[PDB]
Amino acid sequence: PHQPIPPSLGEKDLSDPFNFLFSSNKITLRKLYDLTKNVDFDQLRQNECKKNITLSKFWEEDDNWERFYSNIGSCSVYSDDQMIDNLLHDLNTSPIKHVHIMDGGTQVKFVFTFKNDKQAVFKPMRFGRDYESDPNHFYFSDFERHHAEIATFHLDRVLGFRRAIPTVGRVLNMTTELFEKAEKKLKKTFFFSPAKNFCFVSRCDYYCDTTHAICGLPDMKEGSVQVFLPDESAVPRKHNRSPYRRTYSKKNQVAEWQSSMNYCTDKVKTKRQYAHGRRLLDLVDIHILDYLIGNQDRHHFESFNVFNDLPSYAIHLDHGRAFGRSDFDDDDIILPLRQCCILRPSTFQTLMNFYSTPKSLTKALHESLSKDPAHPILAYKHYPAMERRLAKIMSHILECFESRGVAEVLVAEYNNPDV
Numbered sequence: 001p002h003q004p005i006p007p008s009l010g011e012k013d014l015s016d017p018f019n020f021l022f023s024s025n026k027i028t029l030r031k032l033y034d035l036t037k038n039v040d041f042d043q044l045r046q047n048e049c050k051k052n053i054t055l056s057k058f059w060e061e062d063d064n065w066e067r068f069y070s071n072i073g074s075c076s077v078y079s080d081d082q083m084i085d086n087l088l089h090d091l092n093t094s095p096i097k098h099v100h101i102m103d104g105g106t107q108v109k110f111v112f113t114f115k116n117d118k119q120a121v122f123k124p125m126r127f128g129r130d131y132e133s134d135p136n137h138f139y140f141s142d143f144e145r146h147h148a149e150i151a152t153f154h155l156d157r158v159l160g161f162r163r164a165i166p167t168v169g170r171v172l173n174m175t176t177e178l179f180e181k182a183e184k185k186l187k188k189t190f191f192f193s194p195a196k197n198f199c200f201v202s203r204c205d206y207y208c209d210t211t212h213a214i215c216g217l218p219d220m221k222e223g224s225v226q227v228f229l230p231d232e233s234a235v236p237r238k239h240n241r242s243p244y245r246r247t248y249s250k251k252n253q254v255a256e257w258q259s260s261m262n263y264c265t266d267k268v269k270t271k272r273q274y275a276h277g278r279r280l281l282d283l284v285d286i287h288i289l290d291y292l293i294g295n296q297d298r299h300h301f302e303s304f305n306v307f308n309d310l311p312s313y314a315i316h317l318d319h320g321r322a323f324g325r326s327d328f329d330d331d332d333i334i335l336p337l338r339q340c341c342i343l344r345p346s347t348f349q350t351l352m353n354f355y356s357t358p359k360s361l362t363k364a365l366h367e368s369l370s371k372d373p374a375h376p377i378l379a380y381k382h383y384p385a386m387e388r389r390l391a392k393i394m395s396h397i398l399e400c401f402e403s404r405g406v407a408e409v410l411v412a413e414y415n416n417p418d419v
Ligand SMILES: *[C@@H]1O[C@H](CO)[C@@H](O[C@@H]2O[C@H](CO)[C@@H](O[C@H]3O[C@H](CO)[C@@H](O)[C@H](O)[C@@H]3O)[C@H](O)[C@H]2NC(C)=O)[C@H](O)[C@H]1NC(C)=O
Pocket: 049, 052, 073, 075, 076, 079, 080, 081, 082
């Protein structure tokens, strides 16, 4: 079957997820050690965030949604892992009151309204964990992977960013939790395949059709469950076009930043929004995240616009098109690091230590993913891929230093002398 059962309901893979060969380059490691061993990282980390305050203290707790919303910080989506794990557990277990077709993106997704009237975003499982994207597919043709959303949230935490949105795996009874709880116009898009599996078409721009319907085996269906963002009226948001947006066309397949190595110097460092602040440092952080997971679909950034007079940060969202290929690294994604050559000091240290201990990043990710009820979240073949991609990032960091000085790269805030 193209759409298999949730792996958690299948035979348990007992194989060693780390019986693969990886040995980090020691030359690169030591060279990255000398130019930074005397840098006062402690002083730097304290400048990466101007003012660290939450929404509750700014606006001057019945459930885990409300405590999450209140604890949304000005330099982070969340701190305190234990309450998020409580929110995750709640997202997995809370009874569903309503299911509605979600208004927004292009691929199939529902908004869950729980009994307590709180909400979440649902993205249905389609293919298995082992599935790799068609090599002929562009970034805009890939069907989203629910398990990538889960995997990235955990990885975003492991990297200490905590700017992704809490997401948990969940296996639904399509009859009781989806169909019977679905709005009428969604309800009518349900049907049975010739194999007597339960299926729904839903309605959306991207292949919500009979041919590409989501189907259970026969009646269960795993999906990613992501806590809804706080209301737009209460916590408004900004939608910003990325300067490293891809072309999204098959004819002209090469954007300027893909062909021009001076793109960062000439086209973004000189822009109003990026010349001063944290935005560019955010962009480097997110493309490091996108490169590790192979996410090519970063066309826009989403940010809260609620902490007045404080710099906003990009919310690490939309990771459905990540983890599509385990045997391919898209060096184009990490281009902003190579072109801009600035890097948040905490990120460097965080990136460090992980590299200095081979397999530690992927090990630190796996146990984190394991606590998700839908584990295994990622096929193990993606683990060596992430270690390799990490190594390239380190090499690319080394390149940034000698060309554009080491004291010019590691900054807690970015300022362009010419704006
Ligand atoms: C901005 O303020 C945030 C809130 O204080 C902040 O939070 C704290 O961050 C640390 C980072 O790990 C958390 O840490 C540790 O201690 C708990 C307590 O047992 C352990 O369970 C963890 O494993 C970890 O060792 C704190 O929990 C967290 N404080 C809370 C409760 O929110 C940010 O660090 C501040 N600035 C930044 C960098 O965004």
